[PDB]
Tab-separated table of all heavy atoms in Angstrom:
chain	number	residue	atom	x	y	z
A	1	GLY	N	176.917	54.313	-9.083
A	1	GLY	CA	177.482	54.660	-7.793
A	1	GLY	C	178.996	54.677	-7.795
A	1	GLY	O	179.636	53.985	-6.998
A	2	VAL	N	179.581	55.468	-8.695
A	2	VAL	CA	181.031	55.549	-8.840
A	2	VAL	C	181.623	56.422	-7.739
A	2	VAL	O	182.846	56.576	-7.649
A	2	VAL	CB	181.418	56.087	-10.230
A	2	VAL	CG1	180.798	55.231	-11.322
A	2	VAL	CG2	180.988	57.539	-10.375
A	3	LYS	N	180.764	57.002	-6.901
A	3	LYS	CA	181.193	57.880	-5.819
A	3	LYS	C	180.755	57.348	-4.458
A	3	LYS	O	180.579	58.116	-3.509
A	3	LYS	CB	180.666	59.297	-6.036
A	3	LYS	CG	180.977	59.869	-7.410
A	3	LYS	CD	180.687	61.360	-7.466
A	3	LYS	CE	179.750	61.692	-8.616
A	3	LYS	NZ	178.400	61.094	-8.419
A	4	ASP	N	180.573	56.031	-4.350
A	4	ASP	CA	180.131	55.436	-3.094
A	4	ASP	C	181.252	55.342	-2.067
A	4	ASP	O	180.985	55.395	-0.861
A	4	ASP	CB	179.543	54.046	-3.352
A	4	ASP	CG	178.038	54.074	-3.529
A	4	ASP	OD1	177.453	55.178	-3.488
A	4	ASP	OD2	177.439	52.994	-3.707
A	5	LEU	N	182.501	55.206	-2.515
A	5	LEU	CA	183.639	54.991	-1.630
A	5	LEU	C	184.488	56.246	-1.450
A	5	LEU	O	185.718	56.157	-1.373
A	5	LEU	CB	184.501	53.841	-2.152
A	5	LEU	CG	183.796	52.502	-2.372
A	5	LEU	CD1	184.776	51.460	-2.892
A	5	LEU	CD2	183.131	52.025	-1.090
A	6	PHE	N	183.857	57.416	-1.378
A	6	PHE	CA	184.564	58.680	-1.243
A	6	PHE	C	184.031	59.452	-0.043
A	6	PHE	O	182.870	59.301	0.348
A	6	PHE	CB	184.429	59.525	-2.516
A	6	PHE	CG	185.132	58.940	-3.708
A	6	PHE	CD1	184.540	58.969	-4.960
A	6	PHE	CD2	186.380	58.355	-3.576
A	6	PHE	CE1	185.183	58.429	-6.059
A	6	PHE	CE2	187.028	57.813	-4.671
A	6	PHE	CZ	186.429	57.851	-5.913
A	7	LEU	N	184.894	60.284	0.537
A	7	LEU	CA	184.568	61.063	1.721
A	7	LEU	C	184.846	62.539	1.474
A	7	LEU	O	185.629	62.911	0.594
A	7	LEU	CB	185.362	60.580	2.944
A	7	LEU	CG	185.584	59.071	3.079
A	7	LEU	CD1	186.620	58.774	4.152
A	7	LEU	CD2	184.274	58.360	3.382
A	8	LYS	N	184.193	63.381	2.269
A	8	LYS	CA	184.280	64.825	2.131
A	8	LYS	C	185.433	65.386	2.963
A	8	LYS	O	185.989	64.715	3.835
A	8	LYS	CB	182.958	65.474	2.542
A	8	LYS	CG	182.820	65.754	4.026
A	8	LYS	CD	181.470	66.383	4.332
A	8	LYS	CE	180.382	65.328	4.450
A	8	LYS	NZ	179.133	65.879	5.045
A	9	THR	N	185.788	66.637	2.676
A	9	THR	CA	186.927	67.300	3.295
A	9	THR	C	186.463	68.460	4.165
A	9	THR	O	185.295	68.858	4.149
A	9	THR	CB	187.917	67.811	2.240
A	9	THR	OG1	187.504	69.106	1.787
A	9	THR	CG2	187.967	66.863	1.057
A	10	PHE	N	187.404	68.997	4.936
A	10	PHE	CA	187.165	70.146	5.799
A	10	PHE	C	187.816	71.372	5.170
A	10	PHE	O	189.043	71.427	5.039
A	10	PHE	CB	187.718	69.896	7.202
A	10	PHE	CG	187.646	71.092	8.107
A	10	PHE	CD1	186.454	71.775	8.285
A	10	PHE	CD2	188.769	71.533	8.786
A	10	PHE	CE1	186.385	72.874	9.120
A	10	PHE	CE2	188.705	72.632	9.622
A	10	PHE	CZ	187.511	73.301	9.789
A	11	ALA	N	186.992	72.350	4.783
A	11	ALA	CA	187.511	73.523	4.089
A	11	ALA	C	188.444	74.335	4.976
A	11	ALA	O	189.467	74.846	4.507
A	11	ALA	CB	186.356	74.390	3.592
A	12	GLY	N	188.112	74.473	6.256
A	12	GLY	CA	188.978	75.191	7.169
A	12	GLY	C	188.432	76.528	7.626
A	12	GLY	O	189.195	77.480	7.811
A	13	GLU	N	187.116	76.617	7.809
A	13	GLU	CA	186.502	77.837	8.310
A	13	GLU	C	185.153	77.501	8.927
A	13	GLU	O	184.355	76.773	8.331
A	13	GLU	CB	186.331	78.879	7.197
A	13	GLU	CG	185.494	80.082	7.599
A	13	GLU	CD	185.182	80.991	6.429
A	13	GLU	OE1	186.116	81.643	5.918
A	13	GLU	OE2	184.003	81.055	6.023
A	14	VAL	N	184.907	78.040	10.118
A	14	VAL	CA	183.646	77.870	10.829
A	14	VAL	C	182.839	79.151	10.680
A	14	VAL	O	183.371	80.254	10.847
A	14	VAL	CB	183.873	77.524	12.313
A	14	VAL	CG1	182.548	77.260	13.003
A	14	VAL	CG2	184.788	76.318	12.440
A	15	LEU	N	181.550	79.001	10.368
A	15	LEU	CA	180.747	80.141	9.934
A	15	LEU	C	180.208	80.947	11.111
A	15	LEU	O	180.300	82.180	11.114
A	15	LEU	CB	179.600	79.656	9.046
A	15	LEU	CG	179.995	79.032	7.705
A	15	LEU	CD1	178.815	79.018	6.751
A	15	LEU	CD2	181.167	79.778	7.093
A	16	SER	N	179.627	80.271	12.105
A	16	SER	CA	179.034	80.914	13.275
A	16	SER	C	177.874	81.823	12.884
A	16	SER	O	177.259	81.634	11.830
A	16	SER	CB	180.087	81.703	14.061
A	16	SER	OG	180.221	83.017	13.552
A	17	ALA	N	177.566	82.810	13.724
A	17	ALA	CA	176.419	83.685	13.532
A	17	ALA	C	176.832	85.140	13.722
A	17	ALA	O	177.944	85.446	14.158
A	17	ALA	CB	175.278	83.327	14.493
A	18	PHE	N	175.913	86.040	13.384
A	18	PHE	CA	176.141	87.473	13.480
A	18	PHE	C	175.885	87.969	14.899
A	18	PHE	O	175.348	87.256	15.749
A	18	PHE	CB	175.249	88.230	12.495
A	18	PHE	CG	175.740	88.190	11.076
A	18	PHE	CD1	174.936	87.690	10.066
A	18	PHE	CD2	177.006	88.645	10.753
A	18	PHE	CE1	175.387	87.648	8.760
A	18	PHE	CE2	177.459	88.606	9.448
A	18	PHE	CZ	176.649	88.108	8.452
A	19	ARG	N	176.283	89.214	15.146
A	19	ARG	CA	176.130	89.857	16.443
A	19	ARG	C	175.150	91.016	16.324
A	19	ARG	O	175.312	91.885	15.462
A	19	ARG	CB	177.478	90.355	16.969
A	19	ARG	CG	177.375	91.275	18.171
A	19	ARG	CD	178.611	91.179	19.047
A	19	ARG	NE	178.730	92.310	19.960
A	19	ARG	CZ	177.987	92.483	21.045
A	19	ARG	NH1	177.053	91.612	21.390
A	19	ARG	NH2	178.187	93.556	21.803
A	20	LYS	N	174.142	91.029	17.193
A	20	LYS	CA	173.133	92.075	17.162
A	20	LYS	C	173.720	93.408	17.619
A	20	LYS	O	174.811	93.479	18.190
A	20	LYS	CB	171.943	91.704	18.046
A	20	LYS	CG	171.351	90.339	17.747
A	20	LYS	CD	170.372	89.910	18.826
A	20	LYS	CE	168.963	90.375	18.503
A	20	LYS	NZ	168.277	89.447	17.564
A	21	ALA	N	172.974	94.477	17.356
A	21	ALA	CA	173.373	95.807	17.789
A	21	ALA	C	172.837	96.079	19.189
A	21	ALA	O	171.641	95.910	19.450
A	21	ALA	CB	172.868	96.865	16.811
A	22	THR	N	173.725	96.498	20.087
A	22	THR	CA	173.371	96.816	21.466
A	22	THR	C	173.593	98.307	21.680
A	22	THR	O	174.733	98.749	21.858
A	22	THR	CB	174.197	95.992	22.453
A	22	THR	OG1	175.588	96.131	22.142
A	22	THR	CG2	173.811	94.525	22.374
A	23	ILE	N	172.507	99.078	21.666
A	23	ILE	CA	172.589	100.530	21.792
A	23	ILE	C	172.200	101.030	23.173
A	23	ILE	O	172.508	102.187	23.500
A	23	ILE	CB	171.732	101.238	20.721
A	23	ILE	CG1	170.270	100.818	20.853
A	23	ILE	CG2	172.247	100.915	19.331
A	23	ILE	CD1	169.302	101.968	20.766
A	24	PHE	N	171.547	100.212	23.990
A	24	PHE	CA	171.082	100.633	25.304
A	24	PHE	C	172.114	100.422	26.404
A	24	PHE	O	171.823	100.724	27.566
A	24	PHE	CB	169.785	99.902	25.662
A	24	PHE	CG	168.597	100.352	24.863
A	24	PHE	CD1	168.050	99.537	23.889
A	24	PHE	CD2	168.033	101.598	25.079
A	24	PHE	CE1	166.961	99.951	23.149
A	24	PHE	CE2	166.941	102.017	24.344
A	24	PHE	CZ	166.406	101.193	23.378
A	25	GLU	N	173.298	99.898	26.077
A	25	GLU	CA	174.362	99.801	27.072
A	25	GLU	C	174.735	101.184	27.591
A	25	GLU	O	174.767	101.420	28.804
A	25	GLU	CB	175.582	99.103	26.468
A	25	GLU	CG	175.268	97.800	25.744
A	25	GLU	CD	175.641	96.574	26.554
A	25	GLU	OE1	176.565	96.672	27.391
A	25	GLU	OE2	175.013	95.513	26.357
A	26	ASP	N	175.016	102.110	26.680
A	26	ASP	CA	175.105	103.527	26.997
A	26	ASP	C	173.686	104.101	27.007
A	26	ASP	O	172.708	103.353	27.078
A	26	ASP	CB	176.040	104.233	26.013
A	26	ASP	CG	175.586	104.099	24.579
A	26	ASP	OD1	175.144	102.997	24.196
A	26	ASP	OD2	175.671	105.097	23.834
A	27	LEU	N	173.559	105.428	26.968
A	27	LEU	CA	172.294	106.158	27.024
A	27	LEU	C	171.627	106.057	28.388
A	27	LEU	O	170.464	106.455	28.535
A	27	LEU	CB	171.304	105.708	25.941
A	27	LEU	CG	171.825	105.516	24.516
A	27	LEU	CD1	170.684	105.152	23.583
A	27	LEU	CD2	172.542	106.763	24.029
A	28	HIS	N	172.326	105.529	29.388
A	28	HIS	CA	171.878	105.569	30.772
A	28	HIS	C	173.103	105.405	31.657
A	28	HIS	O	174.145	104.911	31.218
A	28	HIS	CB	170.822	104.496	31.064
A	28	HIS	CG	171.393	103.156	31.407
A	28	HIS	ND1	171.999	102.343	30.475
A	28	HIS	CD2	171.439	102.482	32.581
A	28	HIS	CE1	172.398	101.228	31.061
A	28	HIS	NE2	172.072	101.288	32.338
């Protein structure tokens, strides 16, 4: 357990999610 007293870092980017395609906004 030579890594028991260590902590992780923050890379600096939030991933989030993708955006769906909305095609019915127009066409009416």
Side-chain angles (χ1 to χ4, degrees):
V2 304
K3 308 192 234 66
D4 266 2
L5 304 180
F6 293 139
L7 322 168
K8 86 181 82 167
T9 85
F10 174 52
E13 171 188 291
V14 184
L15 295 199
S16 87
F18 282 123
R19 168 151 163 74
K20 307 168 90 83
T22 52
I23 59 135
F24 289 108
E25 311 257 333
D26 59 319
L27 315 183
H28 85 288

